[PDB]
Structure formats: structure tokens, C-alpha cells
């Protein structure tokens, strides 16, 4: 079915500044979004921020100054913050959006409509921090920092506090056997696997149904009111997750502000999510809440969520870390360093490792040999001669490629993905090594054709399925290759040889990455 590749962040809550967490997710968001764009597809990708709740009401209380206002700088943050990353995010959202609000409403209408909202109460454990309601089961004894024998959350290590208030409640129980069929039926509708294997657990053993109303003074009065109800307020997390669907449905302007609300989600073609990235922090309400809410509506339910090891919610400012070693570099390291898991150092020490090494040793020194006048003398793509018994080895590994990174990337699984290349990549130094085009210049003319040909496409081909992950090197790099426009693009320049020999390099200058010292 052709729609368009819809790809979200996590909106972000706006108590704190932006830090790495958010920075990291939405460069997830972004690169999913980038490659689906040099593949030739439409893509939406969308980020933004949760600004409703008694926690950031709070965060504002602490500061001394309104809501509206905190949300409104904070947003702001966020907003430059993204910018000065260098993403390509096609919408920023805001739950304090009145169009978004109009959306909250009528998704709500329609569960209670379809009788899967019902007036009780909810009686337990509550992190504000997380938003989130939790069972005996997981809370523990802790600290505030007062420093006081108080509850705090097992997964968060937050404090939790006891709510007994009137809620309107969403039927959640009711949509067990039909999440649980949901699951078996997609099995890579959750990545990774353990993950996908741990919200099924959690589903198998029993769901309580879900306090999605709050007491309005209980909020500070900071959040979207109940349809006919101004008593009670919207649970930020219904507020929160439905930023998706109202998404969906935003005609955006070439400057980025919303312009129109759509009645109907196909309209614009975007709705379900293709691809949902969050934290592992947030994965109950994407991948239990979420869904039941949209099986209730009658919706159609999202593709994938993908979960990363980070609390997306000792300082590492990345504009900072990219302002000294470069933002492809940072964006790389980020990408490369760990999959699923907390587990890879962040160091000083390991980024410069991963610089010099990869990105300059093996990507940026092969990229000054095949367009280095010593070796490349007429400044072009030569005509390739016959192919030996290792040229046709490396190859195969060049046109292998983007079959192999095209199904990590649609996992998604981005870590994989650039380990696929840089293996590529390896080969091909390996290549330039043993032939050593430098003695062939004056020994064997005929074979440098050859073996120059094969560098130069293995650079281009190598360099395209990196162009997500390095989106203004790709573009430099291209350049000096000389490689058209139209050929840095489309699954058709995935194809070995899509660049004809006689095309001439791009003006010298200069270095791609420069090393570091250690
Ligand atoms: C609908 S995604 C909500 C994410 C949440 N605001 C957080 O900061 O974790």
C-alpha cells in the first residue's frame, strides 16, 4: 500500500532543558526519515514536546512564572536545540496546540461513545516524574532529597505518592486477547525481540483498566478539560500519545507552522506510524495503552515501535561535543556506539577512537585516494578494463549492500546498518592496499582503470547508505566524486554502476575528517 513513511519521536516533557536523551531519539526519528527519503518515498517525520501535567505545572511553580510561559520558552529550547542538531524533522508539535486539543476531544468522545470509558476511581501508587500509574509490585523504599524514608518507583527510581481520586476510567482490561493477538500476529511490531517478549509477559499475566481522567486542582489546572466534564482534566498521556494521530492530520506550510486540521486521518495519508521511536522507559503506554486506545476508536494500529536503551528522561552537552568534533561525527558516534542497550562508553577517549579510526582512517582516507590527483590524474571516473577474480569479490560485496543495510534499517536497527557499510568499507581499503594504485600510475595504466573504477563506486555506493548518518559529509563527499545530483538519490543509484565513467571530479581544495590527538 502506498502512503506516506510515517515516522515519530517521543514528544518530549518540558520540566527540564533539552538534554542528550531527546537529542538522541529524534536523531533515530530523523535518520529513519532520511533514509526512507533517499530511497524516493514521501516521508512525514514528526517531534515535539508534552507540555500539560502536574509535573511540568510543578516545574513552572518551582521557577515562579505561568505555565503558558514555561512551556512557551522551554518549547523554544527544544525548537533551537533541533536546529542546531541539524535534523530534518518535517513537523515540531505541541499539546498546548489548539488543533491538537480538538483531536484529544474527539478521540476521547468516540472511547466513551463506544462505551470504553466508565466514571470510578483509581486507589494506588503514582510517579508525577513518570506520569505514570504503578502496582505495589513496583515500588520500593528510597529517599526524597530532603533525605527521608519516602516510596519511589522501580522502574524510575522517582518518588511516588498515594491517589485516591474519582477518575474517569478507560476499559483496558477488555482489550487483552485482542493486544495479545495483535502481538503474535506482527511479530516484529515491537523491536527488539526482548523487549517484544516483555510487554507480552506483562499482557499474559492481566491488565487493570486505566485511570484516563484526573481531579482538575489535583493538576494545578494545567491540562486539556474532559468533554462535558470541566471538573476533571485529560490524563497527560492520552493528551501525549494522541499527539500522533493529530499529527496525522496537520497540513504543514514551507516554514513549518500548521496551517489546516483535517477531519479525516487518510486525507494525508501519514496515519498509522510506519515507525514509532521512544525510550524503553515509555514502552507500556506505546505498546499497550496506545494500541487499546486505537482498537477502542476503531483505528488502525502502528507498524513498529522501536525501543532504545536510554531513559530518554557528569554533563554531556552534544552541541557542545559537536562543536568540537564535528555534528556528522557526534551523529555517527551516537548511532554507532550502542543498539539496544546503556551499554558502550561515552567517552572523550572513544569518540576520538571512532573518529580517527573509522570515519577518518578508513572512510576519509579512502575518500582522498580515489580523488587525489597523484592516483586519479585525469580528475575522473576511468573506464574499467576486464575484472580479475578479486575485483569480482569486492564487487559483489558493493552490489550486496544496500539489499543487506536496506532490511537493518527497515529492523530498524541503525547500529547494524553502518556496521554493514563500514565491512564494506574495510574491503575496499583492504582492495586498495593489495592492488596499490599509487605503483600502477606508472607500472600498469590499464589496470588502474580497473581498480580506481571499482574504489570510486564502492566510495559512492558505501557513501549513500551513510548519507542518513552523514548528511553534509555524504554531500561533500559526493561532491568530490562529481557524482550528479540526480544520482545521489533513489533505489535506482543503489544499483552498481549508476554513475558512467567520463564523469569528471568535483574542484579540489581541505580534509573530510580531521584526526585528533590522543
Ligand atoms: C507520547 S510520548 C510522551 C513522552 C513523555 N512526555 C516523556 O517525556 O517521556
Request: with cysteine; net charge negative; aromatic share 12%.
Amino acid at each position: 500500500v502506498e502512503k506516506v513513511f510515517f515516522v515519530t519521536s517521543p514528544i518530549y516533557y518540558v520540566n527540564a532543558a533539552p538534554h542528550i536523551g531527546h537529542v538522541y531519539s529524534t536523531l533515530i526519528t530523523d535518520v529513519i526519515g532520511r533514509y526512507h527519503r533517499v530511497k524516493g518515498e514521501r516521508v512525514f517525520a514528526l517531534t515535539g514536546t508534552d507540555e500539560h501535567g502536574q509535573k511540568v505545572a510543578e516545574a513552572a511553580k518551582q521557577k515562579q512564572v505561568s505555565p503558558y510561559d514555561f512551556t512557551t520558552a522551554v518549547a523554544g529550547e527544544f525548537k533551537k536545540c533541533f536546529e542546531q542538531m541539524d535534523y530534518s524533522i518535517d513537523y515540531f508539535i505541541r499539546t498546548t496546540n489548539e488543533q491538537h486539543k480538538a483531536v484529544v476531544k474527539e478521540l476521547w468522545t468516540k472511547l466513551e461513545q463506544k462505551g470504553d470509558i466508565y466514571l470510578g476511581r483509581y486507589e494506588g501508587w503514582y510517579s508525577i516524574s513518570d506520569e505514570s500509574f504503578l502496582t505495589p509490585q513496583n515500588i520500593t523504599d528510597g529517599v526524597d532529597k530532603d533525605g527521608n524514608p519516602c516510596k519511589v518507583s522501580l522502574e524510575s527510581g522517582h518518588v511516588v505518592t498515594w491517589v485516591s481520586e474519582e477518575n474517569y476510567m478507560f476499559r483496558l482490561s477488555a482489550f487483552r486477547e485482542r493486544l495479545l493477538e495483535w502481538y503474535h500476529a506482527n511479530p516484529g511490531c515491537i523491536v527488539p525481540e526482548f523487549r517484544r517478549r516483555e510487554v507480552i509477559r506483562a499482557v499474559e499475566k492481566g491488565l487493570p483498566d486505566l485511570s484516563v481522567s484526573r481531579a482538575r486542582a489535583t493538576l494545578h489546572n494545567w491540562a486539556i478539560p474532559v468533554p462535558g466534564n470541566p471538573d476533571h482534566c485529560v490524563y497527560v498521556w492520552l493528551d501525549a500519545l494522541t499527539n500522533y494521530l493529530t499529527g496525522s492530520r496537520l497540513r504543514v506550510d514551507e516554514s513549518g507552522k500548521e496551517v489546516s486540521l483535517v477531519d479525516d486521518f487518510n486525507e494525508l495519508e501519514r496515519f498509522p506510524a510506519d515507525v514509532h521511536v521512544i525510550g524503553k522507559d515509555i514502552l507500556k503506554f506505546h505498546a499497550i495503552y496506545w494500541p487499546a486506545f486505537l482498537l477502542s476508536a476503531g483505528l488502525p494500529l502502528p507498524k513498529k515501535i522501536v525501543a532504545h536503551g536510554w531513559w530518554t528522561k557528569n554533563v554531556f552537552d552534544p552541541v557542545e561535543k559537536a562543536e568540537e568534533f564535528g555534528y556528522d561525527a557526534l551523529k555517527y558516534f551516537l548511532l554507532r556506539e550502542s543498539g539496544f542497550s546503556d551499554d558502550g562508553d561515552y567517552s572523550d577517549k572513544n569518540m576520538i577512537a571512532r573518529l580517527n579510526g573509522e570515519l577518518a582512517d578508513t572512510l576519509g582516507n579512502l575518500v582522498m585516494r580515489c580523488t587525489s590527483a597523484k592516483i586519479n590524474v585525469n580528475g575522473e571516473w576511468p573506464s574499467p578494463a576486464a575484472y580479475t577474480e578479486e575485483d569480482e569479490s569486492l564487487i559483489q560485496l558493493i552490489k550486496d549492500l544496500p539489499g543487506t543495510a536496506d532490511h537493518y534499517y527497515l529492523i530498524p536497527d541503525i547500529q547494524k546498518a553502518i556496521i554493514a557499510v563500514f565491512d564494506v568499507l574495510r574491503a575496499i581499503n583492504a582492495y586498495v592496499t593489495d592492488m596499490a594504485p599509487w605503483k600502477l600510475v606508472k607500472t600498469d595504466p590499464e589496470r588502474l582503470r580497473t581498480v580506481l573504477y571499482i574504489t570510486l563506486e564502492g566510495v559512492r555506493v558505501t557513501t549513500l547508505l551513510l548519507s542518513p548518518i552523514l548528511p553534509r559529509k555524504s554531500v561533500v563527499i559526493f561532491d568530490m566524486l562529481g557524482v550528479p545530483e540526480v544520482h545521489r538519490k533513489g533505489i535506482e543509484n543503489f544499483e552498481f554502476g549508476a554513475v558512467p565513467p567520463g564523469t569528471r571530479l568535483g574542484p579540489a581544495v581541505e580534509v573530510l575528517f580531521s584526526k585528533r590527538s590522543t
